[PDB]
């Protein structure tokens, strides 16, 4: 007939909140992502399925990808601190074209350069030579200068370490939990009818790319399409493949590495003498495999938009070299690949390999920071990296052309969207164990 | 008949101790960082405490001392990422100025030209810049050199930060508290009749000065005198008054800003060209308001001495110009003003603008840290500075025989008195919530 | 059976795990900043009876953590100091002949170079004095520093000092340190008399390679410790029962002038010496050394056959960093050719000796090709009085039939100096929870 409130401590109630994450890695010499001062990951996957739960997951609002954009650059600056500096290298280069079994496409690409720099002591000098690419060497008024000389001074970044993406696990702190949505047909934003809690997430490889997803997690049964608004003109509509398609990117030059001393304990590594016939770096994609893979997303794109509507693919529109080319990593050396040969497509209703020219840069700006640059050291030997491409970063164009001839082009001016396809299942939530309820209590007085 | 013990939890008990504080800002770049400072709570509860007394103690508490160490440390953290300004110590060929020069700036501003390296290290360019007379020293048109290069040369302040004083708050840490006083007559010591408890303080100005306190906390009704030992001559006297007299410190030289690039990503912000007529910077103070302020301070100094003595106001004694003259900050500049006209009066027993010259030194130095310094970049336009003078620092002359003709003269060679008067109510104190008292308890055993 | 579980709060249960430590000082010194809690006036030594606790040596975590601590203590000590990169300059670098003796001919070098002034547009010809073990030939010849083809480094700031201040490594809350008090405590084995101590006694972190200085001596007899007394590839640790004084000095009244290396920051060069210059030497009495050499060989008859010929020889060789003595007398690092201290043999049954000691100023001494240091000069003469207490030896075996069982003083590494100082302690973790059968039943209200 009457109710009295009682205290319940330790009941399952969670409220949305934000926090920092942890580090976790397995099987241990030096790494830029997972240093030696990191706790090892758990040996058992605590995945607890839940029932009678419907939670509204909201990507593009969680700050885990913003937290990802916070600690990677913190790790990226930290490895650069105890490194040899390359500020005296933009003294005026006297360069010339190299012609030693040269092809037509590499004519004017590589430059045999020579300049004057210090020895171990600071009173003797030597006339040393090195090799440089066209994309980082510009004119002055035969005298050439580095592209980074009118910008911030910058370093070589310690070739004893590697940029190999080792999968890292973000583990939740004590008192919190991470919810994983196991729904197979869950798109960007909306309720999740089957969510499972987990203490710490699965392996996430911190790879960086601007156009295509590399080495990502595959889909379950059907390729998914996620966007801010299905009618939006921007904000990087993206897809995720369900089947993996492989790519081989090779550098067929017999490149060698020589040690040239900046000064006392200041060892700098420069490109030596190439051996044999030089060939352009190229990436091969199977023509039949890529065409049928593109033949599956075109069916998935026809239900969000109108039926019996033709769509035409196109290459990049414009911008700098970091957005119009497929930029990624291959064994510690950066690639900038032309992508017109994979994105010339026109599809109509009622329905051996492709080569890609690719240019190589040595000094790049990894992010939009203006305060630093990294001189990729020339790494020896022929390199052959195998990888799977599993996603696209597309940008549509406007114009009310009767909802016909829609244009899709690979963009991706923002580079933190790479981790959105890896952290889409997960969200950070705060556990509140205290609760109240009315009962018949009448606490007696002793 | 006997008594039994008790434990009390949460009782009001204070014992004196010391504790580091933490920042609290209103969340409004700044050299007083404020980007990572904790936002303040917009409700200080002014809990009045009745039937209470508290013995405060100025010049012994470390509340001013703990914040004093944070003044240097906050500027050091904002100076390390700034660009180094060492390599301009090449010899300076210097000339004089032109374009309708007046008698007051006759030989103070100097036109200097010197060699300088460029972005290409083996190429140099000749540049010109304007420097003051207190920026170069003579090497025996003649060759001048920087004053602060035979001493430890330093950097320049970044253009993004600003030296405007944000009134910051120091909330008490958890488990700790501070108390404020609300009396009328106040020594450096004395039991406070009305003590109030608050966690987060009001606005505290971190502005620095040596001669005249400006932008300080106003008084209540009348002029109170603070001194460690009023009979001693080596103790600094802190005087604050209720009516804020205004100063209009102007820089009537309209100047531009020129960027001289000294290296890769390193730009030295040189002075441009003085366009228009040139005039010496000065500060304006009202004649009538300043004299009655001196008329409102003569009464309360006579209550601490005899009524037959005659007080004489003179200027500073002598020494370095940085300690014997006025010094403050107005929009990134550092004014050195001659205060002879402010302290030239005699007081017998019972249109209106006072002007005073001001000098400009671009190179400013730390008062205690001679190991480094900072170079204030020039600011384009006309610098307008309006401020309230709230406090003065006076020093009594040595000797003063026969207890008559007691002259009061300026001084104050320390920088800790600028905030000692701004924390006059406050003293950190430690609470302990435990207590034992006798009673008639007999706990029932089970 | 009427048995029910209960729990106990505050039970001594010992588990072994790695543990971070504290700091304590005995009331600038950046080498041991001691910005820590002061030690208690009266430590709490509590002897524990009826307990046999196993202690293990050479795998203890106390020596490994503090080895990383002094490296981190060193790196913080040198980052607020001036860089000496403007010294890889061609040195018109020559002899010195005034007031020299026979064996010092060529060791000291009057050596000059070019260096800048306040203006970075005018140079000057300054001069300094450098030792032979600091410069290397290139071809009044041309010379360069040793560290010019390796990592550039700084100099130690002159105000701070590197003298050994005793410090205490104390366990945190929920943690304990067990001190064994056995007079004949073998390193590998259980200690039948284990006592507990909150914070240990003073520890002097001296950096020595050949011998051990200012260590904790034994009580009544010298002791020998070894991981594998059959193996000949491990260092032999010997801890003395009595201290032997050593007298090392530099007889040069060396001045010290400071030149301006650049913008205000300075480089403290070596000034011109006053008077005649002799060789630095260390003094050890024969009466207190031959008898204690008979003590250490007496304990060698309890681990091997007593009918064995024992010989003492010189070092094996290698670089100068490990074949000679190295210590920290007054901020000056001497290098002593210890040959008369290890030249003896024993049959199967006043008199101070001088030691040739050379002076070096660029010392690496952490097996690091990443940083080094320039030692500043010290005004006046150098004077130290110390006790030697440890002999890091090496069994030069290979031979058989228990014949000519020689020992060569080695000490290639540097963590074995501290293995004889932290020898009494082992970290334990207390578990204040536990269960036991009890006839008790919990009542229900």
């Amino acid at each position, epitope marked *: 007939e009457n109710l009295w409130v009682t205290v319940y401590y330790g009941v399952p109630v969670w409220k949305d909140a934000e926090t920092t994450l942890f580090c976790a890695s397995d099987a241990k010499k030096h790494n830029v992502w997972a240093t030696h001062a990191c706790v090892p990951t758990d040996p058992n996957p605590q995945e607890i399925h839940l029932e009678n739960v419907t939670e509204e997951f909201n990507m593009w609002k969680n700050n885990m990808v913003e937290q990802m954009h916070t600690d990677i650059i913190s790790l990226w600056d930290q490895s650069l601190k105890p490194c040899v500096k390359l500020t*005296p290298l933009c003294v005026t280069l006297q360069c010339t074209n190299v012609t030693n079994n040269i092809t037509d496409d590499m004519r004017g690409e590589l430059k045999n350069c020579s300049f004057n720099m210090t020895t171990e002591l*600071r009173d003797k*000098k030597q006339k040393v030579y090195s090799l440089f690419y066209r994309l980082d060497v510009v004119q002055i008024n035969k005298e050439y200068r580095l592209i980074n000389c009118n910008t911030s001074a910058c370093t070589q970044a310690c070739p004893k370490v590697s940029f190999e993406p080792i999968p890292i696990h973000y583990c939740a702190p004590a008192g919190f939990a991470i919810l994983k949505c196991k729904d197979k047909k869950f798109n960007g934003t909306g309720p999740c009818p089957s969510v499972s809690t987990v203490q710490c997430t699965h392996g996430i490889k911190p790879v960086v790319s601007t156009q295509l997803l590399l080495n990502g997690s595959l889909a379950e049964e059907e390729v998914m399409i996620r966007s801010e608004n299905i009618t939006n003109n921007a904000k990087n509509i993206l897809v995720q493949f369900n089947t993996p398609v492989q790519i081989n990117c090779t550098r067929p030059n017999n490149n060698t590495r020589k040690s040239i001393r900046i000064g006392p304990g200041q060892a700098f590594y420069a490109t030596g003498d190439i051996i044999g016939d030089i060939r352009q770096a190229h990436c091969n994609v199977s023509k039949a495999t890529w065409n049928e893979t593109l033949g599956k997303v075109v069916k998935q794109l026809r239900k969000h938009f109108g039926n019996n509507t033709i769509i035409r693919f196109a290459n990049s529109s414009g911008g700098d070299l970091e957005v119009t080319t497929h930029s990624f990593n291959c064994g510690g050396e950066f690639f900038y690949c032309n992508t017109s040969g994979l994105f010339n497509s026109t599809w109509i209703s009622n329905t051996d390999s492709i080569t890609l020219p690719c240019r190589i840069k040595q000094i790049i700006n990894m992010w939009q920071r203006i305060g630093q640059c990294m001189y990729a050291p020339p790494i020896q030997g022929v390199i052959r990296c195998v990888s799977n491409i599993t996603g696209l970063i597309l940008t549509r164009d406007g114009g009310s052309t009767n909802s016909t001839t829609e244009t899709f082009r690979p963009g991706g001016g923002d580079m933190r969207d790479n981790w959105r396809s890896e952290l889409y299942k997960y969200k950070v939530v705060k556990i509140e164990p205290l609760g109240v309820a009315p009962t018949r209590c009448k606490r007696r007085v002793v | 008949e006997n008594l039994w013990v008790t434990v009390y939890y949460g009782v009001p008990v204070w014992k004196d101790a010391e504790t580091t504080l933490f920042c609290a800002s209103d969340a409004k770049h700044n050299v007083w960082a404020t980007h990572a400072c904790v936002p303040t709570d917009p409700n200080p509860q002014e809990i009045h405490l009745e039937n209470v007394t508290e013995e405060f103690n100025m010049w012994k508490n470390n509340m001013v001392e703990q914040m004093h160490t944070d003044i240097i440390s906050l500027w050091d953290q904002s100076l390390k990422p700034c660009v180094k300004l060492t390599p301009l110590c090449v010899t300076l060929q210097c000339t004089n100025v032109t374009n309708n020069i007046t008698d007051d700036m006759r030989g103070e501003l100097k036109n200097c030209s010197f060699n300088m*390296t460029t972005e290409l*290290r083996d190429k140099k360019q000749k540049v010109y810049s304007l420097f003051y007379r207190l920026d170069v020293v003579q090497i025996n048109n003649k060759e001048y050199r920087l004053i602060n290069c035979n001493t430890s040369a330093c950097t320049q302040a970044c253009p993004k930060v600003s030296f405007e004083p944000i009134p910051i708050h120091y909330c008490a840490p958890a488990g700790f508290a501070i108390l404020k006083c609300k009396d009328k007559k106040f020594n450096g010591t004395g039991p406070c009749p009305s003590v109030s408890t608050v966690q987060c303080t009001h606005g505290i100005k971190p502005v620095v000065s040596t001669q005249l306190l400006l932008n300080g906390s106003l008084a209540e009704e009348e002029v109170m005198i603070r001194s460690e030992n009023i009979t001693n001559n080596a103790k600094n006297i802190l005087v604050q008054f209720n009516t804020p007299v205004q100063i209009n410190c102007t820089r009537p030289n309209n100047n531009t800003r020129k960027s001289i690039r000294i290296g890769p990503g390193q730009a030295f912000y040189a002075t441009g060209d003085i366009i228009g007529d040139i005039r010496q910077a000065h500060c304006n103070v009202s004649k009538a308001t300043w004299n009655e302020t001196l008329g409102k301070v003569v009464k309360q100094l006579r209550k601490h001495f005899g009524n037959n003595t005659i007080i004489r106001f003179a200027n500073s004694s002598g020494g370095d110009l940085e300690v014997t003259t006025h010094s403050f900050n107005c929009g990134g500049e550092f004014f050195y003003c001659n205060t002879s006209g402010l302290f030239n009066s005699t007081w017998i027993s019972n249109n209106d603008s006072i002007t005073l010259p001001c000098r400009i030194k671009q190179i400013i130095n730390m008062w205690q840290r001679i190991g480094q310094c900072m170079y204030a970049p020039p600011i384009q336009g006309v610098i307008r500075c309006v401020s309230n003078i709230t406090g003065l620092i006076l020093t009594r002359d040595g000797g003063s025989t026969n207890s008559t003709t007691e002259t009061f003269r300026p001084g104050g060679g320390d920088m800790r008195d600028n905030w000692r008067s701004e924390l006059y109510k406050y003293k950190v104190v430690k609470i302990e919530p435990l207590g034992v008292a006798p009673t008639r308890c007999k706990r029932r055993v089970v | 059976e009427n048995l029910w579980v209960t729990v106990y709060y505050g039970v001594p249960v010992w588990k072994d795990a790695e543990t971070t430590l504290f700091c304590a000082s005995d009331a600038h010194n950046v080498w041991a900043t001691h910005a820590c809690v002061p030690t208690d006036p009266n430590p709490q030594e509590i002897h524990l009876e009826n307990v046999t606790e196993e202690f293990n040596m050479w795998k203890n975590n106390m020596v490994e953590q503090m080895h990383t601590d002094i490296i981190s203590l060193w790196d913080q000590s040198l980052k607020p100091c001036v860089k000496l990169t*403007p010294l890889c300059v061609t040195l*018109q670098c020559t002899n010195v002949t005034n007031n020299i003796t026979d064996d010092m001919r060529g060791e000291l070098k009057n050596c000059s170079f070019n260096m*800048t002034t306040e203006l*970075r547009d005018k140079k000057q*010809k300054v001069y300094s004095l450098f030792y032979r073990l600091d410069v290397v030939q290139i071809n009044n010849k041309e010379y360069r520093l040793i560290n010019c083809n390796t990592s550039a480094c700084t100099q130690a700031c002159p105000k701070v000092s590197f003298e050994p201040i005793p410090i205490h490594y104390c366990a945190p809350a929920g943690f304990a340190i067990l001190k064994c008090k056995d007079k004949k405590f073998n390193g590998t084995g259980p200690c039948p008399s284990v006592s507990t101590v909150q914070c240990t006694h003073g520890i002097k972190p001296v950096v020595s390679t050949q011998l051990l200085l200012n260590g904790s001596l034994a009580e009544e007899e010298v002791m020998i410790r070894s991981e594998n007394i059959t193996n000949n590839a491990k260092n032999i640790l010997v801890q003395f029962n009595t201290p032997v004084q050593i007298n090392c000095t530099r007889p040069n009244n060396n001045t010290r002038k400071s030149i301006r290396i650049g913008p205000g920051q300075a480089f403290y060069a070596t000034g011109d010496i006053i008077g005649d210059i002799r060789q630095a030497h260390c003094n050890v009495s024969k009466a207190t050394w031959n008898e204690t050499l008979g003590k250490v060989v007496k304990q060698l008859r309890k681990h091997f056959g007593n009918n064995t010929i024992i010989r003492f020889a010189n070092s094996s060789g290698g670089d100068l960093e490990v074949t000679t003595h190295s210590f920290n007398c007054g901020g000056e690092f001497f290098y002593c050719n210890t040959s008369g201290l290890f030249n003896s043999t024993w049959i199967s049954n006043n008199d101070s000796i001088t030691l040739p000691c050379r002076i070096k100023q660029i010392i690496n001494m952490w097996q690091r090709i990443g940083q080094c240091m320039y030692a500043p000069p010290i005004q006046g003469v150098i004077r130290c009085v110390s006790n030697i207490t440890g002999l890091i030896l090496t069994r030069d075996g290979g031979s058989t039939n228990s014949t000519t069982e020689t020992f060569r003083p080695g000490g290639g590494d540097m963590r074995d100096n501290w293995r004889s100082e932290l020898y009494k302690y082992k970290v334990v973790k207390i578990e204040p929870l536990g269960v036991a059968p009890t006839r008790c039943k919990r009542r229900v209200v």
Partner: antibody
Amino acid sequence: QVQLRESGPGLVKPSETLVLTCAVSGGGDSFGFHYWNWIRQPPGKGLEWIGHIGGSSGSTDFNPSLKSRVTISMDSSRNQFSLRLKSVTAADTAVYFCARKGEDFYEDDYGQYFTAGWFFDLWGPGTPIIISS
Amino acid sequence: QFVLTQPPSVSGAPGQTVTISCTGRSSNFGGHYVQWYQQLPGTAPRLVIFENDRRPSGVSDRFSGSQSGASASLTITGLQSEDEADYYCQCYDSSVLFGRGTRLT
């Protein structure tokens, strides 16, 4: 060890072009930095200057009182530079020397250091030139 | 083209110090860094004092120069019988300036 050698004939006809080649030995890569100059001296009087020649790039700076009268060549392959003066008269009877313009290298992280004057550290034995029939 | 002022003959005796000065015109101070040379009878000229006051390592310590404003000086203390040779004053205004020469008797 660098020696500035000399060449050239003896008796020579006036009013035509005379050749002088100076060779440096200990260089290898020590030719591009330092300038090279020709200095001549009449007997009994002071020194006179001729002109410059480039180290690696090649620059021709000459004395203002000997313009359109002397040309200097350079190879940068054998470290040999030739001196060719024309319209030689009987008043040009002098001994000719080839000298090395010194250089004081120094580079710090902040910037580079440059020299001030035209000082000659290395000289040659020289060869006298006589103008007769 | 303007030769520098220089005394053709100066007396030299062992045990004393001589001073040689050279100065042309100094309306605009461009000849800041005067250079000195020493040429034994015939043979090869040498460089004794370089950028105003500095010297190469290998010459005698008694050689010392001075730059007193617009006037330059060279002082040798304790003359002997081997340094009695010719000396030249080298300046720079447009390209290269050479002095006349001296003679230590």
